[PDB]
Motif scaffolding. Sequence first.
Motif, PDB file in Angstrom:
ATOM      1  N   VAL A  69       0.856  -1.223   0.026  1.00  0.00           N
ATOM      2  CA  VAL A  69      -0.012   0.075  -0.102  1.00  0.00           C
ATOM      3  C   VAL A  69       0.707   1.260   0.002  1.00  0.00           C
ATOM      4  O   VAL A  69       0.710   2.093  -0.700  1.00  0.00           O
ATOM      5  N   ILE A  87      -8.494   1.817  -5.069  1.00  0.00           N
ATOM      6  CA  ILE A  87      -9.144   0.776  -4.294  1.00  0.00           C
ATOM      7  C   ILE A  87      -9.194  -0.341  -5.206  1.00  0.00           C
ATOM      8  O   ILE A  87      -8.640  -1.447  -4.855  1.00  0.00           O
ATOM      9  N   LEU A  90      -5.651  -1.701  -6.031  1.00  0.00           N
ATOM     10  CA  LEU A  90      -5.216  -2.147  -4.583  1.00  0.00           C
ATOM     11  C   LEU A  90      -5.870  -3.445  -4.244  1.00  0.00           C
ATOM     12  O   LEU A  90      -5.192  -4.780  -3.799  1.00  0.00           O
ATOM     13  N   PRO A 237      -8.071  -6.407  10.707  1.00  0.00           N
ATOM     14  CA  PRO A 237      -9.468  -6.036   9.777  1.00  0.00           C
ATOM     15  C   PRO A 237      -9.096  -5.725   8.272  1.00  0.00           C
ATOM     16  O   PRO A 237      -9.895  -5.959   7.512  1.00  0.00           O
ATOM     17  N   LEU A 238      -7.879  -5.335   7.934  1.00  0.00           N
ATOM     18  CA  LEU A 238      -7.512  -5.049   6.446  1.00  0.00           C
ATOM     19  C   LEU A 238      -7.617  -6.553   5.776  1.00  0.00           C
ATOM     20  O   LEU A 238      -7.912  -6.602   4.799  1.00  0.00           O
ATOM     21  N   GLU A 241     -11.247  -7.232   5.277  1.00  0.00           N
ATOM     22  CA  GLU A 241     -11.600  -6.504   4.101  1.00  0.00           C
ATOM     23  C   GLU A 241     -11.225  -6.826   2.706  1.00  0.00           C
ATOM     24  O   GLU A 241     -12.124  -6.875   1.655  1.00  0.00           O
ATOM     25  N   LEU A 242      -9.929  -7.207   2.543  1.00  0.00           N
ATOM     26  CA  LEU A 242      -9.425  -7.545   1.100  1.00  0.00           C
ATOM     27  C   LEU A 242      -9.728  -9.010   0.767  1.00  0.00           C
ATOM     28  O   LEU A 242      -9.911  -8.925  -0.583  1.00  0.00           O
TER      29      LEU A 242
ATOM     30  N   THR B   1     -13.684   2.768   3.733  1.00  0.00           N
ATOM     31  CA  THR B   1     -13.209   1.236   3.763  1.00  0.00           C
ATOM     32  C   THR B   1     -11.769   1.748   4.412  1.00  0.00           C
ATOM     33  O   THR B   1     -11.343   2.751   4.675  1.00  0.00           O
ATOM     34  N   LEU B   2     -11.025   0.787   4.833  1.00  0.00           N
ATOM     35  CA  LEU B   2      -9.950   0.655   5.168  1.00  0.00           C
ATOM     36  C   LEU B   2      -8.749   0.861   4.441  1.00  0.00           C
ATOM     37  O   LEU B   2      -7.821   1.949   4.665  1.00  0.00           O
ATOM     38  N   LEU B   3      -9.078   0.549   3.224  1.00  0.00           N
ATOM     39  CA  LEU B   3      -8.034   0.972   2.251  1.00  0.00           C
ATOM     40  C   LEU B   3      -8.085   2.440   1.934  1.00  0.00           C
ATOM     41  O   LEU B   3      -6.950   2.871   1.644  1.00  0.00           O
ATOM     42  N   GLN B   4      -9.263   2.814   1.909  1.00  0.00           N
ATOM     43  CA  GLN B   4      -9.376   4.491   1.829  1.00  0.00           C
ATOM     44  C   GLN B   4      -8.784   5.080   2.806  1.00  0.00           C
ATOM     45  O   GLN B   4      -8.158   6.162   2.346  1.00  0.00           O
ATOM     46  N   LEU B   6      -6.187   4.246   4.792  1.00  0.00           N
ATOM     47  CA  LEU B   6      -4.797   3.936   4.528  1.00  0.00           C
ATOM     48  C   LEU B   6      -4.161   4.986   3.242  1.00  0.00           C
ATOM     49  O   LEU B   6      -2.918   5.533   3.470  1.00  0.00           O
ATOM     50  N   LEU B   7      -5.093   5.047   2.257  1.00  0.00           N
ATOM     51  CA  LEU B   7      -4.677   5.932   1.267  1.00  0.00           C
ATOM     52  C   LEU B   7      -4.756   7.420   1.287  1.00  0.00           C
ATOM     53  O   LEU B   7      -4.299   8.349   0.702  1.00  0.00           O
TER      54      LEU B   7
END
Lengths: 245, 9
Positions: A69, A87, A90, A237-238, A241-242, B1-4, B6-7
């Motif tokens: 990331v 998103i 990734l 949690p990530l 989510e992924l 979201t968590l990706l959001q 982190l970004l």
Amino acid sequence: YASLTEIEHLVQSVCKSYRETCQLRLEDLLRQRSNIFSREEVTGYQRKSMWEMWERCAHHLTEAIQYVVEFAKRLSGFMELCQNDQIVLLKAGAMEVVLVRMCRAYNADNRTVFFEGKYGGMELFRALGCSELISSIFDFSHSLSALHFSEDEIALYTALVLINAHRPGLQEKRKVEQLQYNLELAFHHHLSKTHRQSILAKLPPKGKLRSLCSQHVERLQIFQHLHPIVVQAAFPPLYKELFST
Amino acid sequence: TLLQLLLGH
Ligand SMILES: CCS(=O)(=O)c1ccc(CNC(=O)c2cnc3c(c2)CN(C[C@H]2CC[C@H](C(F)(F)F)CC2)[C@H]3C(C)C)nc1
């Protein structure tokens, strides 16, 4: 229409972005190759509960994903893409990039991988109950190891694994196509300069990485359905989510 | 979201 100067600058930028986010230095991984889990230590891992082994693996995978990331955030052109597309790329590419990076921590000589401080073979992972996926990952790592990637080659290749204009659900496909193309020009230019364009035909087919990632999702579904509380309580949690369905 | 997150969104 990126000039030769712009392409050369992109080579440098991508390599810098990778160096700054490579997680472990290659020198450190190579030095540890002589450090191999003993028979007794391997037995200890094999006797671990399925849940604890899955928990440990999910943690280590997530740590690796976090560096990917960070790689994306520093990668030239990625942050200029729209939020949806960042998103999408990734979510689909994070695991693929980790799998490619993982070849650095793989020793082809004895078929071991660096895990929790020492090198272990596929037998270390028996408690997970996914022998077929694990063997597939070892096979993949072995195939990549044969190419003898330089760090710069891993930088440029993984940038392309991430910037994939064919990912379903992209909103600005043409924007991603342009970035992908410039990265291909960067990769090809670097290879030509170093007499390494031969590796292109030896790179794994895209279906291979896709298959490993789908298999990962499928095996997690199997584990999660059987151990839902473990995933809720202990998994990053990530990671949920992924990969969770 | 968590990706959001982190970004940086
Ligand atoms: C990449 C940046 S680097 O600097 O080169 C680097 C490399 C390595 C380390 C420390 N080592 C690890 O992080 C590590 C090593 N081997 C594994 C895992 C983690 C998880 N994996 C099992 C998992 C697969 C998916 C399985 C599933 F599909 F069933 F879910 C669950 C188990 C095994 C392999 C079979 C993939 N640090 C830094």
